[PDB]
A and B are shown apart, each in its own frame.
Chain A
Amino acid sequence: KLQFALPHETLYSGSEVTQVNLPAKSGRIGVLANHVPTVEQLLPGVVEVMEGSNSKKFFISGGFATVQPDSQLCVTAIEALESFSIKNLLAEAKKNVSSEAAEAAIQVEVLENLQS
């Protein structure tokens, strides 16, 4: 049972899923059907949801994943697709604008794997 969520649109709502791959702060681990209740933060990556055998992949903004005792998954982020998804004016105007600015280095890490 998956429950993918976003502030503007809900994707899943108690729907039955076989396996979901969540990009935790550690490594992209696939959550089993009866996986142990854990609470780990999700860094921007790819979320694969397996409906039976069909493959669905979304690119995630970044939020929190939570396995409940009732083997229920709670995935949340700001904005989640792949068929709907170049910005390089940040490696100079942003990357070297060191004096929002001093921390303008998270931008590069996001887009690099977006192409992936």
Chain B
Amino acid sequence: ISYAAYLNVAAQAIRSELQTSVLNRSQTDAFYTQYKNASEPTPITK
């Protein structure tokens, strides 16, 4: 858990009809993938 996470949660709460852009920042598609000497472990989502 990170401090940026302690803030992310709150930013999701303020999604509470006329919420235009606003919906583009509500979610995102992210896939991180480690790497080795290049080789790379299994790609998971955020």
A and B touch in the complex (CB under 8 A): yes
State which size class the interface on A falls in: 10 to 19
Whether B10 and A8, one on each chain, are in contact in the complex, defined by CB atoms closer than 8 angstroms, is: no
B18 proximity list for chain A (CB < 8 A): 84
Smallest CB separation, B35 vs chain A (Å): 24
Whether B10 and A110, one on each chain, are in contact in the complex, defined by CB atoms closer than 8 angstroms, is: yes
Q: How many chain B residues touch the partner (CB < 8 A)?
A: 15
Q: Say yes or no: is A85 at the interface (Cβ < 8 Å to chain B).
A: yes
Question: Residues on B close to A: CB < 8 A?
Answer: 1, 5-14, 16, 18, 21, 25
> With A87-B13, A107-B9 given, can you name 9 additional A-B contacts, CB distance below 8 Å?
A8-B25, A44-B13, A62-B7, A78-B8, A79-B11, A79-B14, A84-B18, A106-B9, A114-B13
Question: Residues on A close to B: CB < 8 A?
Answer: 8, 44, 59, 61-63, 77-79, 84-87, 103, 106-107, 110-111, 114
